[PDB]
Each structure stands twice: as structure tokens, then as C-alpha cells.
Design an enzyme around this catalytic site. Sequence first.
Site, short mmCIF file in Angstrom:
data_model
loop_
_atom_site.label_atom_id
_atom_site.label_comp_id
_atom_site.label_asym_id
_atom_site.label_seq_id
_atom_site.Cartn_x
_atom_site.Cartn_y
_atom_site.Cartn_z
N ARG B 371 20.36 -18.66 9.96
CA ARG B 371 19.58 -17.93 8.98
C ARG B 371 18.67 -16.90 9.65
O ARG B 371 18.88 -15.69 9.47
CB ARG B 371 18.76 -18.90 8.13
CG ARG B 371 19.62 -19.83 7.28
CD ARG B 371 18.77 -20.81 6.49
NE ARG B 371 19.59 -21.66 5.63
CZ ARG B 371 20.13 -22.80 6.02
NH1 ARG B 371 19.97 -23.27 7.25
NH2 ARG B 371 20.86 -23.50 5.15
N1 LIG Z 1 24.06 -15.08 -2.32
C1 LIG Z 1 24.40 -15.42 -1.06
N2 LIG Z 1 25.17 -14.61 -0.31
C2 LIG Z 1 25.52 -14.94 0.95
N3 LIG Z 1 25.15 -16.08 1.55
C3 LIG Z 1 24.38 -16.99 0.91
C4 LIG Z 1 23.95 -16.70 -0.47
N4 LIG Z 1 23.21 -17.74 -0.87
C5 LIG Z 1 23.16 -18.62 0.16
N5 LIG Z 1 23.85 -18.17 1.22
C6 LIG Z 1 24.00 -18.89 2.50
O1 LIG Z 1 23.24 -20.09 2.42
C7 LIG Z 1 22.24 -20.15 3.45
C8 LIG Z 1 20.88 -20.42 2.83
O2 LIG Z 1 20.99 -21.48 1.88
P1 LIG Z 1 19.68 -21.99 1.11
O3 LIG Z 1 19.39 -21.04 -0.03
O4 LIG Z 1 18.63 -22.29 2.14
O5 LIG Z 1 20.19 -23.39 0.49
P2 LIG Z 1 19.19 -24.65 0.40
O6 LIG Z 1 17.91 -24.07 -0.16
O7 LIG Z 1 19.90 -25.60 -0.53
O8 LIG Z 1 19.08 -25.14 1.82
C9 LIG Z 1 22.25 -18.83 4.19
O9 LIG Z 1 22.47 -19.05 5.59
C10 LIG Z 1 23.40 -18.04 3.61
O10 LIG Z 1 24.39 -17.80 4.62
#
Ligand SMILES: Nc1ncnc2c1ncn2[C@@H]1O[C@H](COP(=O)(O)OP(=O)(O)O)[C@@H](O)[C@H]1O
Lengths: 187, 499, 482, 466
Positions: B371
Amino acid sequence: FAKLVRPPVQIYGIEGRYATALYSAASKQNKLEQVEKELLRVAQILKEPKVAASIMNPYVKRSIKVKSLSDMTAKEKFSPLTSNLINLLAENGRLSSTPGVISAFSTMMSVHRGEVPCSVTTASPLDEATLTELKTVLKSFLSKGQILKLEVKVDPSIMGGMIVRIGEKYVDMSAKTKIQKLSRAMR
Amino acid sequence: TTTAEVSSILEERILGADTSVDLEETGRVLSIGDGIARVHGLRNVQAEEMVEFSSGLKGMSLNLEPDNVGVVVFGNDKLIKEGDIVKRTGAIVDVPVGEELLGRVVDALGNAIDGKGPIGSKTRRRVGLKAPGIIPRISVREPMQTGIKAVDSLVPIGRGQRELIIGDRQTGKTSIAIDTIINQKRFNDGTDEKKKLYCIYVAIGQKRSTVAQLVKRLTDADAMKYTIVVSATASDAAPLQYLAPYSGCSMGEYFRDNGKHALIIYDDLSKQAVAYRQMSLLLRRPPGREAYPGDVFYLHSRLLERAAKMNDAFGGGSLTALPVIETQAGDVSAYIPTNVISITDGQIFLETELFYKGIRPAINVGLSVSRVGSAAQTRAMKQVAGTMKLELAQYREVALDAATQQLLSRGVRLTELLKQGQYAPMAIEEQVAVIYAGVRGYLDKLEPSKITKFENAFLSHVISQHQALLGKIRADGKISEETDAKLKEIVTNFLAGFE
Amino acid sequence: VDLEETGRVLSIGDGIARVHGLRNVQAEEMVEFSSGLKGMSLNLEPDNVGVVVFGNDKLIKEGDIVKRTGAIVDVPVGEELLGRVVDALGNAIDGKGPIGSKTRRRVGLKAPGIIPRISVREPMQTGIKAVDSLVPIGRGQRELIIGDRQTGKTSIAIDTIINQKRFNDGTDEKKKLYCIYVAIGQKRSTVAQLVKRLTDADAMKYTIVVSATASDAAPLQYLAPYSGCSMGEYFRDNGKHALIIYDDLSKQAVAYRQMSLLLRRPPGREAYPGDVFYLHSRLLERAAKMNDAFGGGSLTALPVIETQAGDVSAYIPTNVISITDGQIFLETELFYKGIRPAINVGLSVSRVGSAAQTRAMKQVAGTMKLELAQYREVAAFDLDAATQQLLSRGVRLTELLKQGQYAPMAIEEQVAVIYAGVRGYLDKLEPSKITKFENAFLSHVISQHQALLGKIRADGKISEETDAKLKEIVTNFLAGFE
Amino acid sequence: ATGRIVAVIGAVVDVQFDEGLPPILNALEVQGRETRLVLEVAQHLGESTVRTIAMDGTEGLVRGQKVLDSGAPIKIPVGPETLGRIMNVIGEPIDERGPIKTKQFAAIHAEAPEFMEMSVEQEILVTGIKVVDLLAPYAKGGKIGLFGGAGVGKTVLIMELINNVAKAHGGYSVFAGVGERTREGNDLYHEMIESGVINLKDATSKVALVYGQMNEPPGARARVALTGLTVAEYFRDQEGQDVLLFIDNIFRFTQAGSEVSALLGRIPSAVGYQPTLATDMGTMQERITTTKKGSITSVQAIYVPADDLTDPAPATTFAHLDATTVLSRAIAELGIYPAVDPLDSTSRIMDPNIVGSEHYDVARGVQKILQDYKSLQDIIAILGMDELSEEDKLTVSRARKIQRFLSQPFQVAEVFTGHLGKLVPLKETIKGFQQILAGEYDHLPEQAFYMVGPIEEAVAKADKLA
Ligand SMILES: Nc1ncnc2c1ncn2[C@@H]1O[C@H](COP(=O)(O)OP(=O)(O)O)[C@@H](O)[C@H]1O
Ligand SMILES: Nc1ncnc2c1ncn2[C@@H]1O[C@H](COP(=O)(O)OP(=O)(O)OP(=O)(O)O)[C@@H](O)[C@H]1O
Ligand SMILES: Nc1ncnc2c1ncn2[C@@H]1O[C@H](COP(=O)(O)OP(=O)(O)OP(=O)(O)O)[C@@H](O)[C@H]1O
Ligand SMILES: [Mg+2]
Ligand SMILES: [Mg+2]
């Protein structure tokens, strides 16, 4: 932890631990008899309307109960270790079980001095000569430098025979003899 | 009844001999068993305070009951008996900390186990300090080069980031960490003083022989002089395995709070979770999913959250965490793996299928993400890695037309390019040049089985005579137009020479 | 201080208050706290009384005086509650003023025995074509509206509520059905929206909404179904017909589980108490059809069960299925495939069945059921006369079963529509246009041919003259529409 | 009245008071600690002894330590001065900008709005996301949930929702970070400072932040959501404003309750959860409602442990939501971002009377074709695509194109994939999906609909790979 003197009966339960500890403590300093007397007289000073109440009451502070009992045992001439036992019971909240502790310690000391009663339960009591004959034969059974107590019972269900429990033996020559007639009934 | 309602304590009370024994500062074990020792006394003991037994073992006061104290023993409970005297140390459980531990193999409690003498630590830090808040932290900026081409290219790891290394058994999870430890040697030897990374490795539940061989590998690569090895192996008691991650976390926090940069490797956090589950179940706490306690997520969160990047107000230090989670049959959707994924800032999946096929490292580039990694990546590596990632994604999408044939060929070439040997991390500029070769279509002509040989020869060629170009790339941090032209010329010349 | 008619709180935690005293308190007796909160003595332990608190326990503290009321927990009952939204204890919460009920009834009264009951005869019209055709519900029957979340269970319940309006504002006293709705665990926003829907359809004037929402204490949610059951029993024992909807009994089971676990009672399967089956069985068995000797009243029950991922083999769903007489299976797959209401007619059954159903509806529904069974036999994946014709007829009937929300249909109009579908008047039209044809035909018949519908409703069966006239009008409308 | 600490087990501390037992839900300050350790009374255990849940770490607590009763529940600074400030569970500013000088304080624990105060007004909150706007539209002043496993897109989706609505929202906003990454909180704080939604110079800030993160002990994580909810309640009621309440993650509240209930002495419920799993959740959730005074348009991220929607914590929270968005890991594996499941996300305003007849018809057609494709997936998986009928092949192609077209780039995700975020209006996505269902684009390739916004972008991408 220093080793504690085990009582002969070794009763168990919540009162068991307190009674065993008291027996071990009183065996040291050789105050078993004084503690036994103080226990048999402390039960009576634990059944007054004021004393019996306010200790079964759960809404009075334990501190109040501890003091109410400390001053009571101080003015009741008690200044050895029985006061400590009462204080410990008050602090731990086992005050309601104190009569049980007294009974357990009394049974321990009784086994230390007397013996398990030789319960006889046949029918309405016979002549006093037979009573003293059975007392003498029970003494002969014991015959170990000790004296046993006696408890005579009456049982209409039990037929002409008698059942005697000399300590923990419980011989049986009673209505069960007619029950043993099933052997003839069987084969 | 209660724990302290035993006959011995009652006898002590009634006899009046409760005056000689110091119940304020010492205590006697009532019942030792199941790894938890109940202690009568210690009226002035604190929650989480470390207490030492008569035998020599140390314990943590977990439960402060009204009549007793539940102490978890950091060691074998055989050495503890009923009636043993427990005395306070007057301190929450802490661990020796500082630069004096660099190069020392210590246990969970900081005691040296390498036989090189006592630790010359001067400061002790609590193992359960709260993680820094929102204000003290700043975004991850500096890169943390691991030396792995696949990692440093597609899944960049920042300095202060938390990147999970997740996979099955024998998938290279430990090898990536070891290579990362070795890779930092180039920065530590120099006088940069801002690129130095003092590594830490924590072994939780793995074999003692494996830890010894890892220490031998680090010593042979001359990497022990800047790393700390905290060992809590399988033979060690469950509390030691539970505490080991926090000890290393504190050791890294020392560097973090003094303007220095540190790396902590929580090897097998799943084994720490298993040990904590054992501790909780022996404490008769209600189990949940997979018989785990309800606070395993908190167990890992209060640990990984301590790894962070501090702003210039708090010294500008950092602490990068690379936990390792072992998964059964590649079950990413499992309790502990999903808990750790919800905490870390990324993951590096190491599929057993790729490892079996010979793709070492076995990184699943489709599912491995970072991330906060893009900000903490050098400009030249970013310039090559963006194109590499796009081409690899397009290759994965299609895996008879000429375009898709070229796409598949380029993807195969890049995949063979990402293959790397063990215990040989590469410099950042060398990786940049290698990826530049593949990206700019200088490997489409070569047979796929010859790509590794081509790289082995090209690294030697560039590192020997064309050192000036690599130095220019390292100093600039980007591949300039003149740099691009020179690299293109030299790679074409070597391609012609390679034949 | 007295310890026989009053007592003090030994310990209050998580809505459970241990009481010292109350030596003359009865089992399940409602007790009253110092702060005004009311309770219910469930555990009569030898040295303490375990009282569940009917509300927030922040106002209850150690030492507070607990006083008896002398009566087992009971709920204000009567016909004054019509049009009122009450809570589990019967208190008015809609701000319309106090309830004028003059009588009270225990919430745990025993169900009627074998003798007082009689067979289920009168139909319980729901306004749903699928229910009123293939899974008929009688008056006094208990049908389980089972399914997953967001499948239409509450929609079916509220549509049944609205459909009764035509009977309630009518003349005859034997068709009036006084609905009751019980909201267990739902948020107050959903209940407010439901009562707004009822008021919009003018269905509130004959319904009682007993709400024990999620914010309300677990004892209230556990007691809510019994309160509504007593309110319905009042109508049942006085010659009137009532309908009770428990939405949903799964949340009541959860509340009872919380109460039992907090009362230190041992957990059972899925942490539920041992008597979860009893909890619902002693409730749904109070839905009966009294004979003429007891006034002839009835209490139709419509329990609702929420199943996780369609796991109909779970503990509480299996218990409720075993208790009830029939099940209305709602399936998310059918819901998304455009079949709304998603009533799985393959598995949906009614033990009463044809016993309580109007004659014309039964006559046409037999043919519809046979045709749909054959279609389901040949649905999934080439005789044009045997299979393709049957497949087309089944598709037409399936599109016929689809119905809009909050739009219940009169029974005679349903009979007319099903007659049109069964007798091959829609095989020519496209499947997409079936709904449009149905709406237009509904309008035309309800406008011009109201005499025919009145004849059908009065007779109760479609006769030769009625059949011929219906054929004539359906042919004319088919010619005009297409 | 001052008491003495008797038991210290984890985050649960038992205190015995000589006189004056504090009522339940009353704050108790522990004397003798450098920080401010405040205990929340949970039970009256009898014998003038109370059991408390600590809002901070319990390290260093000595049995017999003096703790003073505050005489009131946990109160936090609330008012316009809380906007643009970061608070912890107990309302202490952790942004090191000084004390929060508010004229009034509000108790953390309050009663939910009564039945009559509830509002039944329903509108549509167009969020600019194709999947959300088309299938499960959001309602202004209605509770919204973002279900999902670990790393499926909950945080990214909630950040995108913030960027779309809150910046363009006229009213105030409240963010309550419950049991999430602290670095995420720092990133959000700096993003809101840069975007100007939070100003450190003048009192023009629009969003107030409350943060209890995963590093906090379970006592803190079980009450920070209540702090954010209390701030939102003040802004809704005492000022009559429209407020957005973003919570992430709300499952950690239930997890913290489960952690503390083991020590509190409760017989565990299913999956080791607390028996009071639905009661406390309902008490917390029913306060997040739109009353007649104001509207709280709440977006809540709900973690789904082990990707199991049948787990009690993510299962009991369905009843508390108007619009539900269920992310799925399987969809995210296919690269379709956002990972919204079109056959599991539902909305309450999805009704032809509210959303319009055309919108409802398009959404229902899309859901029907997707369900048909999913039903056909097994035969396709085993036998092959060539065994299907021509109409079945057409349905599969159209459904795959719809699955691709549901994916949409996000502005917050630009730094990730490099694709510019797209904010489609409702009418444009309605028209695009209607055209796809009709068949106007049955000749374009499937990849032409991937990671694009309006259908014009799809048709301008199809000809690129001519
Ligand atoms: N709209 C999106 N487009 C591309 N990648 C996404 C998207 N949403 C989430 N991701 C992927 O998910 C990861 C982040 O997830 P996150 O929102 O933190 O989920 P959680 O909150 O359940 O842990 C990022 O590394 C990204 O690669
Ligand atoms: N890059 C690599 N190239 C070749 N072999 C490798 C590579 N990385 C690891 N290996 C091989 O993998 C094996 C063990 O790998 P490693 O211990 O790193 O994996 P692991 O999954 O972390 O192990 P474990 O679960 O046993 O601790 C050794 O045989 C080693 O040679
Ligand atoms: N017959 C129907 N026709 C069209 N839509 C319907 C129908 N029945 C229900 N719906 C839709 O279903 C949703 C609400 O369903 P409903 O509340 O009845 O289901 P439920 O299973 O009781 O839900 P919950 O578990 O949330 O209480 C709305 O989107 C509504 O439009
Ligand atoms: Mg419903
Ligand atoms: Mg997240």
C-alpha cells in the site's frame, strides 16, 4: 509453608479446611481442649437475636461485622487463637458456616477422645441388662484403650434381628435374613 | 472455596505467625501448574510487573486476584514448586536495549545464549509500551531495499512500513528475510548515517538448529554485526514464544526513538498466536474461531502498530516490520492470516505452486501488494518498475494473434528475469539496469532458458567495467536521458556480444 | 425491613439483578424496582432471586428496594389497542395518549386443548397470487415465512396486513381480520417506516404494532411475541378473527439466549438454552381455531425466521419448521432472477392445503399447480407440442405469479387472472408483456366487469355461465390488447 | 467517594468502595498515575464492590490503589470547537494543539431517539460509483454498511465515499476511527489538512476526528465509536445540521466487547462471542439515526472475520442498515475493483416509486442476468463454454461485460493503479447499463468495459485495441 498436624477424621468441605487449620494450630501450643470449650461456648454467643442477625445480613460492611465480632470476642474473655479464627471467618465471609466449622472440630476432638457410636437399631429397647451386655461386648470389640459412645434406635421395619454399626463396620442380622431366603426362591 | 482459603494460610492466620513473613514484597506459590503459578502475597505487586522465583525463573503478574496473584512463568514450570518464595523486582516486564545487543543472540528476556558474555546494556525498555499516536508519525518516505528484484520492483517496502510475508511451508518466507538482512550490509558499512538499517530477527517456535544455521549464515555474510537475534524456539515455554516478538519490538523501538532506522522480522507470528492460544486455554478462557482467544487480533495489533515512521519532531527514526505467517494449504481466508492482513500494510504471497515449478522467489505478483510502497521507491526503479508491472499484468491477463504472442513472450522473459538466487541480494542500480534490459525489449530475441545466463553474465559485465554508470544512477536516484542512452548502448553491445 | 414482600438488590449486572429477600415472590412474577423499572423473577434460587430488568439497568444499583406486584407479568389487552403502536409491556409509544384498555391478560397463558379447537375452514386471504393460489393459508393456521435477509418476508407480512382492509371496512363480521404485528430486534427506523406504510394504506385502523426494538432490553424482546399473542387471544376468545406476525422469532431466540446465559443457565446447542424449542412451541401453539362453543374465533400466526445463507437445516429454523403447519420458502436466487415474491413453490407447503380455500381459486389452482409442477420438471437445461408448449405455459404462469409490492389483489381478481393464464390466453403474448397485460386486464375488469367479479365473490365458485362470460371477456381483451 | 482497587485482570478492574457505590456507566479516575486512567463501571458485584472496564492500559495498578469516583459518565468536549480536532475515547485532544475549549460537555452513554422522533423521509445519495448508484443506492440520512473481509477494499471505498460526498457536503462531518491502522488515521488527517476540510489557522474546519486505534486496549476500542457517535449526536440535535458519520471499523467495537466479556465473567455465546452481542450493538446503532431534528448519513465499515458473513458480529448488523454494500474476495481476485458483490448488496430505496421506474428496471435486469450467469457458471466450469446454447452464450457474454463495466477507478486509488479516478453521474451509468442490457455493445470485447467510467469511455477504449 510449615507442615500442619492432620486431624484423625480429616473431614472435607469449606468447613473442613478451617477445622483442619484450627486443629493443626491448637495441636501446637497444646490448646486443643481450651479451643474446643471456646468453640462450644462461641456457638451460643452466635445465636442471639442481635448476633445471629447482622451477620447473615449481606448489606452490612464486612469491616463492621469484623469489629462487631472482635469486640464481642474480646469482651467474651477470648484472647488466644480462637479470636483469630473468628476474625478470619468474618474477613473471608464464611461466618454463616461457622456452626459447621464448630461441629467439624467437635467431631475431630471427639474422635481424639471418644469413638464412633455403635448404632444399634432393632426395635423398642430391651431390658437394661441386655443394654449393658451389648455395651460391654462393644467395648470388647473396641478394646484399644478407648471408650465408645452408644446410640440406640428403634425400627419397626427391622424384624427380630438387630443391626450394629461398631465404628464403620455395620454388621447386619435383621430383616435382610428373610431377604436371603431368595436363594431358596432362586434355586 | 478460594485459592488462598487453603488450610496452610488459614493456619498461618489463626496461629498469628503472619508477621514474620513479608507478604508486602514477597509471596509463596500456592499452586504451580498448566504454566500459571498462583502466588499468595505480593500485596504491593503491580499489574504486568515482573517477579522472580526462588529457582531463578522470572514471571509476569497477569491476574491480581483479591487473595492471590496469577503469575505466568517465563520458563519450564518443573523448576517451580508449591511453597517457593516469589519476590518482586519493582518493574514492569522489560528487556535490555541498546546498541550493545548488536551481534548478540538473546532469548525472549534478553539473556545472552551465544556464550559471548553478558549484555552490556545500560537502559531497559518496557516490552508493552503503547504504539505512537497519529501526530508523532509521518508518511513513509525512505525506501527499504531488500535486494530482491521482485520485492524491490513490484512490491516495494518502505522504511517504517509493515509488510507481511505470507505463504505455506518451505516457500522461501525465511529466505526473503535473510536476504533483506544481508542486503543492508552495503548501507551499514558506509557513512550515510541515514540509510543504515539495524536489523532484528525474532524466532518464534522454530527449530533451534534452524536458528543456529541462520546465525551462521549471517555471520558468514558478515551481517551479524548489525543485527539482533531474539530466539524463542520450540523447546522454549509458551510464555517465552508469546513474549519474544515484544522484546524484539522494544529493541527496534530503541532505534526508532533515537533517530535511527531499524528492521524487525517477526518470523512465524502464527506460532506466537498458537503459543498465546495455549496460554489462554490453560487459563480456561473462552475460545473462539479455531479455538483461538478473542484477543489474538489485539495480540498482533499492539505488536505491529509499534512499527512506524516518526517525523522529524520525534527524531525522524523508523521501524520496519516484516512478519511471517504460515498458512495451511494456501488458506489466505483464515483467522490468523486475515487478522494479520488487516494489520499490515501489504503482503507477499509465496505460492507453493510457483516454488515447485522453480520460480524462486515464489512471489505471487498478481496478489502481492504494498500500500505505502510507491512513495518509498527510487525514481529509476519506479520508472522501470511501472512498465514492468504493466507488462506483467497484461501477460497475466492473456495467459495466436501476433500482439498477444508478443505479450506472452515479453511476460515469459520478465518472469524469468524476476527469478533470483539465494543469499545474493542485488544493489538497487544493478536491479534497475537488469529490469531496464528486459523492459526495453532487449531479451525478446533470446531463448527463455538462456535469460538467467544472460543476467549472470550481464551483471558481471556491468559491475566490472561500467561502474561509473551504476554510480551515476545511485547518486542521481533516477535514470536520466543521457543515462538512458548510455545504458541502451551498453546493453545493446552486450546483447550483440552475448550471442 | 420486610424480606417477604420486598427485597434489596444484591448485584446488578448486564440487566440481571440478584435480589436478597422476596421470600413470597412467585415464578415469572413481575417485580418493581426503586427507580421505577419493572422486572420479572425468573430464577428463584435458594438464597437469591434472579430478576430480568425491563429496561436500562444504569438506574439500578446495589441496595435498591425491590417490591413485588403480586401478579404474573400481564399485558393490557382489548380492542382499544387497535391503531396504537405499543411496546412489549403494552405502554403506548406513539404519543397518542394512554391506552384505554379495561382488561389485562397473562403473557404465558396455556394454549387451547384438543376439545376447543375445530378444523381450519375460513381462508386467510393475503392478496398474494402465489400464496393464495399454490400455498393457501387458512384462518387459525400458522405459516412460517422463512428465508434469508432481504428476500421479502416483511413484504409478504405487510402485504397480508394491507389486503385485509377490504374485509375490515366491509359489512359482514365473519371476514374481519384484526391484524397484529410484532417487531423483534428491528431498528426503530424500520418500524417507523412500516407504520407509515400502514397509515398510507389506511391499514393502521385495525392493526396493533407491538415493537421491541434492538435498543430495548433483551427481556422486552423476549416478552414481545407473548404480548402480541395475548392481544390476539383476546380477539380469538371473543368470536373475532385475528392475525399475528412475529418478525422475527430468530431475534427473540437470540434475546432469550442472552437472558438465559446472563442468568448463569448452562448453554446448549449454539449457546442457545435447552428449551428454545419450548420457547416457540408454547407460543405458536396458541394459534388456534375455536369452535362455535367458544365463540368461533381464531388467531392466524405468521412467524418469520431468518436463515444464514439459506441454511434451512439450522437449529432454530428446524425447530420452527417442525412447530408450524407450513413453510413459505423465500430464496434469494429466485429473488434476483426476477421472481418477486421469491416464493419457492416447489418446497413451499401448507398442511391445511385445499381445506381452507375458495372453490373457484381451488378449481383453477389445481390446474396451475399441475402445470407448474410439470414445468419445474422440464425447466432447467424438443417436442413443440409436449415440452416446448409445456415450457411456454410454465413461463407464462411464472410471470403470472410475479406481483408488485404493497399491491395486494382481491381474491376474485386473482381467480380471473389465473383463469386467463391457465386456459391458454397468454401463450400467444410475449413473456415480457405478461405483466403489462395483467395490469391492463385488472383495470378493465375492475372498471367494466365489476358485476362479474361480484358474482364470482358472492358465489365463491366459477360456474358454467361465469366461465363462458370470463372466456368471452378475456378473448375480447386479448384481441384488443394485441 | 473514593474506593480501592481489589482486582486487576486485563482491562477489567474491580474496585471496592467503603461508601457510595457509583452507578453503572460512571467514570472513575485512578489516582496516582502519570496519565489519566479512567474506569467505566460495568457491574455492581455486591459487597460494596464494582467491576469496571478501563479506558487505557492497566499496567502498574496495585491492589489497594486509591481511585476517585467522578460522579458522572465519561463526558467529552463537544461543540463547534471540536471540528478539525483529533480526540481519543475520553475526549482528550491528541493533536497537541491545546485543550478543546467547548462551552458544554456531553455524556458518552445516552438513550437512543424515541419512536416518535424517528424520521421516514427517504432520498437518494448519489455517490458517483456505478455499482453503488445502480444496484444499491444510498439514502441521505440512512445507515450504510461496507461489508468485507481483510484487504478487500473497505478502507479504500470509505475514503472514496468521503472524497465524493463530504467535500461536496454542505453540513459537518464526523470520522470515528475504531480499531484501524494508526497510519491510516495520520494519512486521513494530513489529507484533510491539505484539502482544506481541516484548517489549523481559522475556525473553518468542517470535519471532526475521533481515533481509538488497534493499539488501544479493548476498553478504549469499545467506547471510541460512542465518542464519535456522541459528537455526531450533538451536531445533529443541538444545531439541527446534516452530518456525515464515517465509522471504520465498527466490528472492532464488537470484538472489544468480546475481549472484555471473557474477563467480566459471562458464559460465552456462539463463536466465543459475548451473550450481550445484539443488545450492546443495538444500543450503539440505534443512536446513529435520522431524527426530526437532523439527519445522520452514516457510512460504517464492517469487518467480516475469515470472510464469513454468517459470523454473529457481521450477521446481527445487517438489520441496522438501510443500504448494504458487501465486498467479496472472489471478485477482487478477478481484478474487479471495487469488489462489490452485485448479487449480495441491497438497498431499501431500491424501489420504482423512490428511485424511478427506469432505474429499478435496469437494476433488476442487471441482477437477473448476473444471477443467470452465476447459475450457468457450474456447467461452464466443468463441461465448457461450447456446450451452451446460443442464447446462453449471449447471456454469458453480456453478463461478463456487465461485470467488467461495474468496475470503476477511484480518485483515492489513482496513486495505486495509475488510472485517473472517474465520477460518473447516475443518469450516465443508468444509460450505459441499459444499453449493455439492450445489446448495442454486443460486438465490443469484454476488456473494453474494464476500469472505465461512462460508456463513452468504454467505446473509446474498444477501438484503441482495434
Ligand atoms: N478501488 C480499488 N482499486 C484498486 N485497488 C483497490 C481498490 N480498493 C482496494 N484496493 C486494494 O486493496 C488494498 C486496500 O484495501 P483496504 O481498503 O485497506 O481493505 P481493508 O480496509 O478491508 O483492509 C490496496 O492495496 C488496493 O490494492
Ligand atoms: N531464492 C531461492 N532460490 C532457490 N532456493 C531457494 C530460494 N529461497 C529459498 N530456497 C530454498 O527453500 C528451502 C527453504 O526455504 P525457506 O526456509 O526460506 O522457506 P520457508 O517457507 O520460510 O520455511 P519454513 O516454513 O521451513 O521456515 C531451501 O531448500 C532453500 O534452498
Ligand atoms: N414483491 C416484491 N416486489 C418487488 N420488490 C420486493 C418485493 N418484496 C420485497 N421487495 C424488495 O425487497 C426489499 C425489502 O424486502 P423485505 O424487507 O420484505 O425483506 P426481509 O427479508 O424481511 O428483510 P430484512 O431481513 O431486512 O428485514 C426492498 O428492496 C423491496 O423493494
Ligand atoms: Mg424484514
Ligand atoms: Mg481497513
